[PDB]
Amino acid sequence: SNLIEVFVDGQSVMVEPGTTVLQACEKVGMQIPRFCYHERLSVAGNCRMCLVEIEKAPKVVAACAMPVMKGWNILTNSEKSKKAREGVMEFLLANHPLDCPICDQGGECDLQDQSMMFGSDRSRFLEGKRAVEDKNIGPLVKTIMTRCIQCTRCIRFASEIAGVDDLGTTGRGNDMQVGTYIEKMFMSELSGNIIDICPVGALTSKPYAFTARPWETRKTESIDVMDAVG
């Protein structure tokens, strides 16, 4: 066949060429940590949480954007990968606001869960944190941009999935802000989905605000009836 042989933790996997390290690892039930990679969005490669060690390679690679080579052995749980994850989460939490009690993403935060599973347990950051002014993009999506981790998921969704190019980044460096740069409503028939793709509470639902916590809710799987798409 065209399939090539790779190794995840010494286990042999046969993958189609072009498959990335993340997909090769997930073929054996291992989920590489991520913040900016979405499988229905274009690859970004900027969050750097997916950094993993390839055996006999001095450098860690971004698993979300690196195609697997023939004969590669991926060490998803070696000391290098763990240290890379801890450093990345340290940098992610250096400027994050202490907002978890008031954040609506409280029990549903990928930042929280991946900090508990892959990061350290304390902080050695002894400076002041950054604060970003909030943007208004309509009555559906509530914006609190101090929680933004700059994964640019919303920008990619709007540009590709929604076909609206209103969202972007202004500035550069630490003072790089996601927004519209002008007072503009992000109107789209699919505009609420940016609430879901946002890993953090930077984008939340305004009608849903403060009403419940995820552990309280009971989930019923059903069908939408507002149109014929079902």
* Residue closest to 64 by CA, chosen among 7, 24, 101, 30: 24
SS (H, E, C) 86-99: HHHHHHHHHCCCCC
- CA dist 133 to 27, 136, 177, Å? 42, 10, 9
Selected from 30, 100, 161, 164, the binder of ligand SF4 by CB under 6 A is 100
Strands 4-8 and 73-75: parallel
Candidates 45-53, 127-135, 185-193, 219-227; binding stretch for ligand FES (CB under 6 A): 45-53
Q: Using CA atoms, how far apart are residues 126 and 76, in angstroms rounded to an integer?
A: 31
Within residues 169-228, the interface with other proteins by CB under 8 A covers 169-177, 179-183
Residue 151 marked in a binding site: yes
The yes or no reply on residue 111 touching ligand SF4 (CB under 6 A) is yes
Dig out the tokens for 230 from the structure: 């079902």
Name the strand (E) or helix (H) holding 214.
none
Q: Which 74-93 positions form the footprint of other proteins (CB under 8 A)? A: 83-84, 87-88, 90-92
CA angle 106, 80, 22 (to 5 degrees): 65
- Contact flags string 31-50 toward ligand SF4, x per CB under 6 A: --------------------
Which residues on neighbouring strands pair with residue 204, listed in sequence order?
142
Nearer to ligand FES (CB atom), residue 152 or residue 188:
152
Positions 174 through 193 that interact with ligand FES (CB under 6 A) = none
Annotated binding-site positions for Mg(2+): 105, 195, 198, 200, 203
Could you list the residues that contact other proteins (CB under 8 A)? 45-49, 51, 59-60, 62, 65-67, 83-84, 87-88, 90-92, 94-95, 124-127, 133, 135, 149-150, 165-177, 179-183
Annotated binding-site positions: 35-37, 46-48, 50, 64, 96, 100, 103, 105, 109, 148-149, 151, 154, 195, 198, 200, 203
